[PDB]
Amino acid sequence: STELTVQSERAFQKQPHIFNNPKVKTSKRTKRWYKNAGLGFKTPKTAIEGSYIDKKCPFTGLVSIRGKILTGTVVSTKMHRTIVIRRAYLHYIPKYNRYEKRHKNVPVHVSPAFRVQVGDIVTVGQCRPISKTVRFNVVKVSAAAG
Amino acid sequence: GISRDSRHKRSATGAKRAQFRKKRKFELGRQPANTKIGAKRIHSVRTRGGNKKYRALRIETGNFSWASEGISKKTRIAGVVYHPSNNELVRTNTLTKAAIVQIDATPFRQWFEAHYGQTLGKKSKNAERKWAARAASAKIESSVESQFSAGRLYACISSRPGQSGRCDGYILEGEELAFYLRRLTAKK
Amino acid sequence: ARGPKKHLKRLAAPHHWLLDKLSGCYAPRPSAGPHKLRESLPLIVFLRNRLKYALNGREVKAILMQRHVKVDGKVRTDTTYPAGFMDVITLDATNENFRLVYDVKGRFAVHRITDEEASYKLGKVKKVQLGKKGVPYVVTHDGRTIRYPDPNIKVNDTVKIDLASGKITDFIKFDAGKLVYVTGGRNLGRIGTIVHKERHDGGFDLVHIKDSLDNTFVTRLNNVFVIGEQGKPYISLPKGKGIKLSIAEERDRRRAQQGL
RNA sequence: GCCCGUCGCUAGUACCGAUUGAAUGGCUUAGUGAGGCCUCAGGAUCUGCUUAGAGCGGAGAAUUUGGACAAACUUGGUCAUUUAGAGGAACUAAAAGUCGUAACAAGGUUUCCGUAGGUGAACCUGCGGAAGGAUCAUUA
RNA sequence: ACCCACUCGGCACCUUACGAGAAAUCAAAGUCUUUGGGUUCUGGGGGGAGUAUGGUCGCAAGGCUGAAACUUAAAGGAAUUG
RNA sequence: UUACUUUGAAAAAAUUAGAGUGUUCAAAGCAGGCGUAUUGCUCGAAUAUAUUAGCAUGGAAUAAUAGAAUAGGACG
RNA sequence: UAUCUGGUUGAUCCUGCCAGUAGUCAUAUGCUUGUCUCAAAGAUUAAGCCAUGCAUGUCUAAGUAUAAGCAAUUUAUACAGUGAAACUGCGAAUGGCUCAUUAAAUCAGUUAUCGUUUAUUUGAUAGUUCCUUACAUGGUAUAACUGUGGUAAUUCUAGAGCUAAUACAUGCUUAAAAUCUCGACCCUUUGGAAGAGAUGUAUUUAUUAGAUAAAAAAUCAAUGUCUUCGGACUCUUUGAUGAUUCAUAAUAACUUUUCGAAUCGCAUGGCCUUGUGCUGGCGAUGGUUCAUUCAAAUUUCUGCCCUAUCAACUUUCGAUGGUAGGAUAGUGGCCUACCAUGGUUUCAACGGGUAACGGGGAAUAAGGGUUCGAUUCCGGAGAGGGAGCCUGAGAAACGGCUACCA
RNA sequence: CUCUUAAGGUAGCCAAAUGCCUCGUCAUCUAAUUAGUGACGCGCAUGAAUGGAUUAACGAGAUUCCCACUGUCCCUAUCUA
RNA sequence: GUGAACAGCCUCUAGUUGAUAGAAUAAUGUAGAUAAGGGAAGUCGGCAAAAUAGAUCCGUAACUUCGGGAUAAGGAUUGGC
Ligand SMILES: NC[C@@H]1O[C@H](O[C@H]2[C@@H](O)[C@H](O[C@@H]3[C@@H](O)[C@H](N)C[C@H](N)[C@H]3O[C@H]3O[C@H](CO)[C@@H](O)[C@H](O)[C@H]3N)O[C@@H]2CO)[C@H](N)[C@@H](O)[C@@H]1O
Ligand SMILES: NC[C@@H]1O[C@H](O[C@H]2[C@@H](O)[C@H](O[C@@H]3[C@@H](O)[C@H](N)C[C@H](N)[C@H]3O[C@H]3O[C@H](CO)[C@@H](O)[C@H](O)[C@H]3N)O[C@@H]2CO)[C@H](N)[C@@H](O)[C@@H]1O
Ligand SMILES: NC[C@@H]1O[C@H](O[C@H]2[C@@H](O)[C@H](O[C@@H]3[C@@H](O)[C@H](N)C[C@H](N)[C@H]3O[C@H]3O[C@H](CO)[C@@H](O)[C@H](O)[C@H]3N)O[C@@H]2CO)[C@H](N)[C@@H](O)[C@@H]1O
Ligand SMILES: NC[C@@H]1O[C@H](O[C@H]2[C@@H](O)[C@H](O[C@@H]3[C@@H](O)[C@H](N)C[C@H](N)[C@H]3O[C@H]3O[C@H](CO)[C@@H](O)[C@H](O)[C@H]3N)O[C@@H]2CO)[C@H](N)[C@@H](O)[C@@H]1O
Ligand SMILES: NC[C@@H]1O[C@H](O[C@H]2[C@@H](O)[C@H](O[C@@H]3[C@@H](O)[C@H](N)C[C@H](N)[C@H]3O[C@H]3O[C@H](CO)[C@@H](O)[C@H](O)[C@H]3N)O[C@@H]2CO)[C@H](N)[C@@H](O)[C@@H]1O
Ligand SMILES: [Mg+2]
Ligand SMILES: [Mg+2]
Ligand SMILES: [Mg+2]
Ligand SMILES: [Mg+2]
Ligand SMILES: [Mg+2]
Ligand SMILES: [Mg+2]
Ligand SMILES: [Mg+2]
Ligand SMILES: [Mg+2]
Ligand SMILES: [Mg+2]
Ligand SMILES: [Mg+2]
Ligand SMILES: [Mg+2]
Ligand SMILES: [Mg+2]
Ligand SMILES: [Mg+2]
Ligand SMILES: [Mg+2]
Ligand SMILES: [Mg+2]
Ligand SMILES: [Mg+2]
Ligand SMILES: [Mg+2]
Ligand SMILES: [Mg+2]
Ligand SMILES: [Mg+2]
Ligand SMILES: [Mg+2]
Ligand SMILES: [Mg+2]
Ligand SMILES: [Mg+2]
Ligand SMILES: [Mg+2]
Ligand SMILES: [Mg+2]
Ligand SMILES: [Mg+2]
Ligand SMILES: [Mg+2]
Ligand SMILES: [Mg+2]
Ligand SMILES: [Mg+2]
Ligand SMILES: [Mg+2]
Ligand SMILES: [Mg+2]
Ligand SMILES: [Mg+2]
Ligand SMILES: [Mg+2]
Ligand SMILES: [Mg+2]
Ligand SMILES: [Mg+2]
Ligand SMILES: [Mg+2]
Ligand SMILES: [Mg+2]
Ligand SMILES: [Mg+2]
Ligand SMILES: [Mg+2]
Ligand SMILES: [Mg+2]
Ligand SMILES: [Mg+2]
Ligand SMILES: [Mg+2]
Ligand SMILES: [Mg+2]
Ligand SMILES: [Mg+2]
Ligand SMILES: [Mg+2]
Ligand SMILES: [Mg+2]
Ligand SMILES: [Mg+2]
Ligand SMILES: [Mg+2]
Ligand SMILES: [Mg+2]
Ligand SMILES: [Mg+2]
Ligand SMILES: [Mg+2]
Ligand SMILES: [Mg+2]
Ligand SMILES: [Mg+2]
Ligand SMILES: [Mg+2]
Ligand SMILES: [Mg+2]
Ligand SMILES: [Mg+2]
Ligand SMILES: [Mg+2]
Ligand SMILES: [Mg+2]
Ligand SMILES: [Mg+2]
Ligand SMILES: [Mg+2]
Ligand SMILES: [Mg+2]
Ligand SMILES: [Mg+2]
Ligand SMILES: [Mg+2]
Ligand SMILES: [Mg+2]
Ligand SMILES: [Mg+2]
Ligand SMILES: [Mg+2]
Numbered sequence A: 001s002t003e004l005t006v007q008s009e010r011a012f013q014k015q016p017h018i019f020n021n022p023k024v025k026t027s028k029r030t031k032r033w034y035k036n037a038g039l040g041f042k043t044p045k046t047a048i049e050g051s052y053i054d055k056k057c058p059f060t061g062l063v064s065i066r067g068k069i070l071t072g073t074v075v076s077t078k079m080h081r082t083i084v085i086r087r088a089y090l091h092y093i094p095k096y097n098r099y100e101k102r103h104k105n106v107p108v109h110v111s112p113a114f115r116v117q118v119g120d121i122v123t124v125g126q127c128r129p130i131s132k133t134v135r136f137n138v139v140k141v142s143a144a145a146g
Numbered sequence B: 001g002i003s004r005d006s007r008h009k010r011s012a013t014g015a016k017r018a019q020f021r022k023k024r025k026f027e028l029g030r031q032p033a034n035t036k037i038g039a040k041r042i043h044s045v046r047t048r049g050g051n052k053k054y055r056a057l058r059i060e061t062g063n064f065s066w067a068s069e070g071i072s073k074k075t076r077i078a079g080v081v082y083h084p085s086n087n088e089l090v091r092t093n094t095l096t097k098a099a100i101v102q103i104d105a106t107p108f109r110q111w112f113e114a115h116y117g118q119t120l121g122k123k124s125k126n127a128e129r130k131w132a133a134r135a136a137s138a139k140i141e142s143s144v145e146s147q148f149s150a151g152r153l154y155a156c157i158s159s160r161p162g163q164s165g166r167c168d169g170y171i172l173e174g175e176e177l178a179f180y181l182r183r184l185t186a187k188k
Numbered sequence C: 001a002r003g004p005k006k007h008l009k010r011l012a013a014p015h016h017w018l019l020d021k022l023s024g025c026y027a028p029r030p031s032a033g034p035h036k037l038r039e040s041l042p043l044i045v046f047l048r049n050r051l052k053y054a055l056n057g058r059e060v061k062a063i064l065m066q067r068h069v070k071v072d073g074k075v076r077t078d079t080t081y082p083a084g085f086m087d088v089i090t091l092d093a094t095n096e097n098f099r100l101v102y103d104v105k106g107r108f109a110v111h112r113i114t115d116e117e118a119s120y121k122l123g124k125v126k127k128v129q130l131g132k133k134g135v136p137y138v139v140t141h142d143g144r145t146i147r148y149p150d151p152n153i154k155v156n157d158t159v160k161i162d163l164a165s166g167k168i169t170d171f172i173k174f175d176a177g178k179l180v181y182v183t184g185g186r187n188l189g190r191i192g193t194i195v196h197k198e199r200h201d202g203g204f205d206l207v208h209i210k211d212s213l214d215n216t217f218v219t220r221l222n223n224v225f226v227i228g229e230q231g232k233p234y235i236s237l238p239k240g241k242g243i244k245l246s247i248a249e250e251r252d253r254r255r256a257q258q259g260l
Numbered sequence D: 001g002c003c004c005g006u007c008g009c010u011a012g013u014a015c016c017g018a019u020u021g022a023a024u025g026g027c028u029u030a031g032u033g034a035g036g037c038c039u040c041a042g043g044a045u046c047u048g049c050u051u052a053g054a055g056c057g058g059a060g061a062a063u064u065u066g067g068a069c070a071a072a073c074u075u076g077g078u079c080a081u082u083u084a085g086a087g088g089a090a091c092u093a094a095a096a097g098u099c100g101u102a103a104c105a106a107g108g109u110u111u112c113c114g115u116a117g118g119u120g121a122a123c124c125u126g127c128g129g130a131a132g133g134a135u136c137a138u139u140a
Numbered sequence E: 001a002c003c004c005a006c007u008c009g010g011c012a013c014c015u016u017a018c019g020a021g022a023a024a025u026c027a028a029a030g031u032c033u034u035u036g037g038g039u040u041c042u043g044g045g046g047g048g049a050g051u052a053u054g055g056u057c058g059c060a061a062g063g064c065u066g067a068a069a070c071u072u073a074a075a076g077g078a079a080u081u082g
Numbered sequence F: 001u002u003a004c005u006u007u008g009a010a011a012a013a014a015u016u017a018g019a020g021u022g023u024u025c026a027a028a029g030c031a032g033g034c035g036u037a038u039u040g041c042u043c044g045a046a047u048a049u050a051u052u053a054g055c056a057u058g059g060a061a062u063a064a065u066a067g068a069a070u071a072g073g074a075c076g
Numbered sequence G: 001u002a003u004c005u006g007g008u009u010g011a012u013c014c015u016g017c018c019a020g021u022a023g024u025c026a027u028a029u030g031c032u033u034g035u036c037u038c039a040a041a042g043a044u045u046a047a048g049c050c051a052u053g054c055a056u057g058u059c060u061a062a063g064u065a066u067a068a069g070c071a072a073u074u075u076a077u078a079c080a081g082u083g084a085a086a087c088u089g090c091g092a093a094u095g096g097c098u099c100a101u102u103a104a105a106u107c108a109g110u111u112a113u114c115g116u117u118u119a120u121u122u123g124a125u126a127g128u129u130c131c132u133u134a135c136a137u138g139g140u141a142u143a144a145c146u147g148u149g150g151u152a153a154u155u156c157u158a159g160a161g162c163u164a165a166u167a168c169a170u171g172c173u174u175a176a177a178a179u180c181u182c183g184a185c186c187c188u189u190u191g192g193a194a195g196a197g198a199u200g201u202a203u204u205u206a207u208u209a210g211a212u213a214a215a216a217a218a219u220c221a222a223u224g225u226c227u228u229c230g231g232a233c234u235c236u237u238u239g240a241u242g243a244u245u246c247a248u249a250a251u252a253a254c255u256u257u258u259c260g261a262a263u264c265g266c267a268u269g270g271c272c273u274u275g276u277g278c279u280g281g282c283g284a285u286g287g288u289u290c291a292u293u294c295a296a297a298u299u300u301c302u303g304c305c306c307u308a309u310c311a312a313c314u315u316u317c318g319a320u321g322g323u324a325g326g327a328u329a330g331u332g333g334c335c336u337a338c339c340a341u342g343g344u345u346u347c348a349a350c351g352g353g354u355a356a357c358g359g360g361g362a363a364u365a366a367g368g369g370u371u372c373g374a375u376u377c378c379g380g381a382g383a384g385g386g387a388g389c390c391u392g393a394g395a396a397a398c399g400g401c402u403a404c405c406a
Numbered sequence H: 001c002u003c004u005u006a007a008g009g010u011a012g013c014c015a016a017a018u019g020c021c022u023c024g025u026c027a028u029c030u031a032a033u034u035a036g037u038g039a040c041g042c043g044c045a046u047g048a049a050u051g052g053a054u055u056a057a058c059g060a061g062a063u064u065c066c067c068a069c070u071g072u073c074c075c076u077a078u079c080u081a
Numbered sequence I: 001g002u003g004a005a006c007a008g009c010c011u012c013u014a015g016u017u018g019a020u021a022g023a024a025u026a027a028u029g030u031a032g033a034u035a036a037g038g039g040a041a042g043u044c045g046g047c048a049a050a051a052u053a054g055a056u057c058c059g060u061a062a063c064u065u066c067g068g069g070a071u072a073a074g075g076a077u078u079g080g081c
């Protein structure tokens, strides 16, 4: 997961209404717009200091996290800028006064700010339909396992 | 009519779901108006809840903005050149967003020479007052000046012509100007 | 289902109207109001089912169309008009007035206030924002929007409101230990003071409460209405003053005043 | 005594079955394709602006270019549910027919198993089992 | 190599029922209405029938999987006396 | 760090349970009750419920889970 | 509201089913049938087909009356009482019915809209319109109506002539500033100055602000005041959120330029130079944005019955994702273009069945359960089957239209 | 049980390229079928390397039907060497 | 050259231009063609004739000696620039 100079698309990649003037000159030539997701979620280093665009990123992008916030472990990284999380849970079946183990998979967009891999319990939260299946964005990432 | 529903689609598991109900107006969609250069013709659409969308059909001459100058004048919009989605729009010269068109540069040339006083790219004592102050900001770009020699400038449609009815944009500057240049020459 | 629903069925109506099961299939379906018809009193319910002045459906109209009733200072023609919390309802030819306030069981109580105290009302400021030209504005629970308000007023305050004109006569902020009427919930209709406001980021702040008899209980911030300064409301509460006497305690008081 | 199978008659259920068997519905490849909607047009008639008369604008019917939507017809397939059938081949009912007597006594060749072949019928024989045997037993 | 005592781990055996079971019997077939250490498999009256059908495996004989209609008040186990 | 456990909030009305009340009894209903019965007083319409999910909360047993092994550990 | 009995034998104890018993807001049927209260009822078979009737229409003082309409006798000579028709307005998207589809679908409880639309209702919001010639109020067009007509026939209509508006199309109008540009002429310094435009609101794009947490001196361009040849620098404008590119404001433009009252009813007051001058009362209907209300659309989490004689499924031709666009009221593979190869599954996908609309609930009454829910409430779907659509705030409507099939 | 002459048609198959009666009978196909196919079988006179039954693939072999196709026909006409 | 190709069609080299000839254009022939609507009703029988046809993509049943059946069946495409 190493992104290039990030300007490779048939379209130009820039955050909306972010204009660094050609006439005026600064030390780092172009500006950067990041934000604060809220709910005590640290908007990380790579976002502010990265080159990426990602109009779908929880920061540096046009989405907004509201509603549920969920956890679960990364299953599939195979996609691009989205991933699959697996939230395991039990289920109470009263007749036998016992539990059965169910599970659900959540497709979730992942910012190029974060780096995730098969492993990796990860915190994720819901922002609007971004694509088809995906209602959730990766807002927080811990390490994997031993 | 066209349907925006997600239930004609397949489930993420892949299964094909039975038709649960009929089509309802609020999930509809309508036909693109593929707006091309020409004597202005704009059709009204009666939207949801009344109101109006405006179909761009033939669009010449709409508003454009020179970013760094902070000024906006109206010009002709010759045609398209590039387009990230479909070259078909280039070839057919259709106007949408992200268009990268070419516009009349002359009303954009006039403002400059009647402001900064330098003719572009080669009495009234109250005027030399002003032109004195505004200098030292009077260098634009090597890449933004050269197009004034031709008479047409590189601009990108930022409106949604089939929606608003206006076709508007902003002249290309900075690296964004460079990005589409490295396209036009290394593509065509 | 193709549009707006113009009917209400009996048994689907709000429980706090205390309608009877039989007598019809339908309720009045309050009009589109200042108040949500969920929590609201249609004029017909008040006049006919509470004041017992009107005996009919046709009779309630004969009152209104006789120009009799007003509400919050202004005459109200509408049969189903949804008089809500903290309203006025003046009848000149009967000389009375009523401020609508909840029971300790949670129903709208039939509560007479005098020719004054029906001057002003209280309302909870739901939002405060910037309007056109820069003009700030504020709006109450009942949908009164009041312009150029006090920069101190934020959401979850109350506002004392002159009727015949409008605007704002002082106000009461929201902090520890203020008088509060409970707008809806399990504890709806109770009165108390603020033991704490449990903050919750992303919705549903819990508000701790203590009443005159030192009972504790919690509800939603959205249902917490500030009615004034501790032990001193800004309006006139009815009997029991929202004290929530226990069911066991109730039985005695009924068999107490019952004798000889 | 109990008791097996064939054979013989009476009634009943399902099965196999030539019919490239029928019927109903869903999803469908192909071909064709109404209708309104969008769009390129068209311009019966009627008609305003600047200046008999000429230039530029608006209103608009039939008709029409292209497009998406798309019923539906024809022909195929697929899935479902139901169903006709000469004949075939079972099983089940009803009893004291016919043939013998396989099993129950060491049932008169102990019985039974898997397998294999054979026989009007139960059955008979080969091999390897088991004991649920007719032997819990020959340091003698 | 033999004897003797101890101790694991074996193929069985004997006596007692402490218990258990319908009984025959059982050191487990006990620790079960004082009902739960963990876990796998199967059975749910007798037939019809391991039949029909589909699938699958086999060169084949066959194996694995495996119904329903319908029929029936018994079938059965252990033990007792004849 | 979860699973769990308590308290709560937010839970439609009917319906179930259930308080009250003399529909003549009752099934019901949510009425009613006292009066001076010549321009009247007045208490009601309680209460508790599927226990999964979600939300807030107290609990830290039980059972899980992470943590310094070629130190790439902690600390100022 | 913790029970059992009858039946396999010569008798016996077991296994085991058959049989009995009781309940059912559970249906049919038979026999019988007096009184009060109460009241389910073509769901099941066939969302099969239906002769006829009915079921959606609607006027206040307060849009439009010259009815060859009724009525008194109108101060009523513009109208004025009543009031058919017809115009404009609004509704006809509610109800009521049915359970045919529908198995992650609907639905429930629970979230979301920092992802949209909203008639109405309630609450606020508007001095700005012409520019170089109605404001004592512009223009025509038409229905009803009358009259000449066609067709077997319909809630069919032709053409001839009248006349209205809150219909249709038009269109003036008002304060004081203040900031912007551009700039005739005067001509030196730290130099200036008439008067010519521009500024309501909305539409479209671009850019700017929407900020602060703790304190000190040096830099450059031109000023931003100011005093007395000494140059001083005093002061940073936020509303809200967990969170925004939010509210709101700023500049440059843009627009077949949105709204900015040519509108009705009751009154008849007050002023003075007395012109029918000037000014005035409570109402009704409107209208721009905003909030509100009645809603709508999508949406988070978790939860469905039988089936493996269904084990792999999705990806032609959208299957999963990325970008851009288009379309929508708006998010989104909703659609298109390009690009990647993703997405689901033994924790049971995918497929099949359902004599399946989901739920609130119902029957049964040790506990734990078993069974049912077409059906009074809520949500959903549909109006013979399918699709398409006009009007509209709201419909993919059927007691609306268009087509096909039957 | 008998009988002449050794036995006395088993497994299979069938109106079969083997059946007289015979255009057997039943079903199927058709408006109609001495045709075809499926059955039935005391089979004049099937029947086991005189080989019996089955059989994928193959065939200028014999046979029936279907779709397509057509002057084969209705019903004939015209053109060129 | 076209093409899968020693195919068929046209061509360079080379060899031929030889097969009695002239005039007509009846009938019937021999050989080559086309037919409205119907579509095997023709006939012992579809005899003859007609329809199919290359290539690319798609899809492809029973049965089976598992090798086949298979080009099964059924569809779409095809120039030029
Ligand atoms: N890098 C400079 C800029 O930083 C900006 O972000 C910073 C501030 O502009 C932003 O300010 C927020 C603002 O976003 C929001 N819309 C309104 C809010 N009142 C402001 O302030 C907020 O942050 C400040 C601290 O800066 C706090 O003191 C304050 O309590 C908090 N409300 O908080 C950020 C603090 O680091 C943007 N990311 C972007 O424009 C740009 O990157
Ligand atoms: N009602 C008759 C017809 O129903 C049709 O609709 C049918 C379908 O929508 C639906 O059919 C389903 C089908 O979707 C699904 N994929 C398979 C399922 N077996 C079918 O089911 C149907 O047929 C089966 C028998 O096959 C019946 O047992 C069942 O009751 C019936 N619903 O059920 C309906 C049949 O009742 C059409 N609306 C129309 O042609 C006609 O009205
Ligand atoms: N009767 C009033 C109440 O209705 C409620 O009805 C439920 C639904 O109507 C409502 O559903 C959502 C709601 O969660 C959400 N916050 C707002 C949303 N508009 C609602 O959904 C609505 O739109 C969807 C989609 O078009 C429809 O399918 C649905 O019928 C409709 N109610 O959520 C409610 C609770 O799940 C409940 N039955 C109950 O609280 C109460 O009876
Ligand atoms: N035609 C088969 C039908 O099977 C039905 O049920 C059958 C099975 O569903 C049921 O269970 C069988 C079991 O017998 C067999 N010996 C083991 C097998 N795993 C089980 O199978 C069943 O359960 C497993 C999960 O355990 C599922 O994965 C499987 O799909 C399901 N058939 O047992 C039955 C077979 O004995 C009914 N018996 C009847 O409808 C019919 O017999
Ligand atoms: N395969 C087609 C190829 O093209 C030609 O064949 C085509 C034509 O020659 C042939 O034409 C035949 C005609 O010959 C024959 N004698 C009569 C037939 N009706 C015609 O054919 C056509 O007829 C009409 C249209 O005219 C349609 O109804 C019919 O479907 C069509 N096949 O139709 C053939 C297409 O089906 C050449 N014979 C040959 O190159 C090759 O066969
Ligand atoms: Mg990635
Ligand atoms: Mg569609
Ligand atoms: Mg109402
Ligand atoms: Mg609700
Ligand atoms: Mg029989
Ligand atoms: Mg088709
Ligand atoms: Mg068409
Ligand atoms: Mg039979
Ligand atoms: Mg047969
Ligand atoms: Mg005998
Ligand atoms: Mg015998
Ligand atoms: Mg014997
Ligand atoms: Mg013997
Ligand atoms: Mg013997
Ligand atoms: Mg003997
Ligand atoms: Mg023997
Ligand atoms: Mg024996
Ligand atoms: Mg033998
Ligand atoms: Mg025999
Ligand atoms: Mg046995
Ligand atoms: Mg017990
Ligand atoms: Mg059994
Ligand atoms: Mg077997
Ligand atoms: Mg089998
Ligand atoms: Mg025995
Ligand atoms: Mg009760
Ligand atoms: Mg342990
Ligand atoms: Mg027995
Ligand atoms: Mg019984
Ligand atoms: Mg019915
Ligand atoms: Mg009914
Ligand atoms: Mg309805
Ligand atoms: Mg289904
Ligand atoms: Mg819900
Ligand atoms: Mg006109
Ligand atoms: Mg006319
Ligand atoms: Mg006329
Ligand atoms: Mg903005
Ligand atoms: Mg009003
Ligand atoms: Mg794949
Ligand atoms: Mg399609
Ligand atoms: Mg995308
Ligand atoms: Mg997009
Ligand atoms: Mg969208
Ligand atoms: Mg793939
Ligand atoms: Mg159904
Ligand atoms: Mg059900
Ligand atoms: Mg239901
Ligand atoms: Mg019970
Ligand atoms: Mg119970
Ligand atoms: Mg029990
Ligand atoms: Mg039904
Ligand atoms: Mg049912
Ligand atoms: Mg309903
Ligand atoms: Mg019908
Ligand atoms: Mg209208
Ligand atoms: Mg509908
Ligand atoms: Mg309707
Ligand atoms: Mg319809
Ligand atoms: Mg109807
Ligand atoms: Mg024989
Ligand atoms: Mg012979
Ligand atoms: Mg023999
Ligand atoms: Mg033999
Ligand atoms: Mg024969």
Ligand SMILES: [Mg+2]
Binding pocket: none
């Ligand atoms: Mg024959």
Ligand SMILES: [Mg+2]
Binding pocket: none
């Ligand atoms: Mg044969």
Ligand SMILES: [Mg+2]
Binding pocket: none
């Ligand atoms: Mg023969």
Ligand SMILES: [Mg+2]
Binding pocket: H035
């Ligand atoms: Mg024949």
Ligand SMILES: [Mg+2]
Binding pocket: none
């Ligand atoms: Mg024959």
Ligand SMILES: [Mg+2]
Binding pocket: none
């Ligand atoms: Mg035959």
Ligand SMILES: [Mg+2]
Binding pocket: H041, H043
């Ligand atoms: Mg025979």
Ligand SMILES: [Mg+2]
Binding pocket: none
């Ligand atoms: Mg024979």
Ligand SMILES: [Mg+2]
Binding pocket: H021, H044
């Ligand atoms: Mg004979």
Ligand SMILES: [Mg+2]
Binding pocket: none
């Ligand atoms: Mg012979």
Ligand SMILES: [Mg+2]
Binding pocket: H050
């Ligand atoms: Mg021989």
Ligand SMILES: [Mg+2]
Binding pocket: H050
């Ligand atoms: Mg021989």
Ligand SMILES: [Mg+2]
Binding pocket: H050
């Ligand atoms: Mg022979």
Ligand SMILES: [Mg+2]
Binding pocket: none
């Ligand atoms: Mg042979």
Ligand SMILES: [Mg+2]
Binding pocket: none
């Ligand atoms: Mg062959």
Ligand SMILES: [Mg+2]
Binding pocket: none
């Ligand atoms: Mg052949």
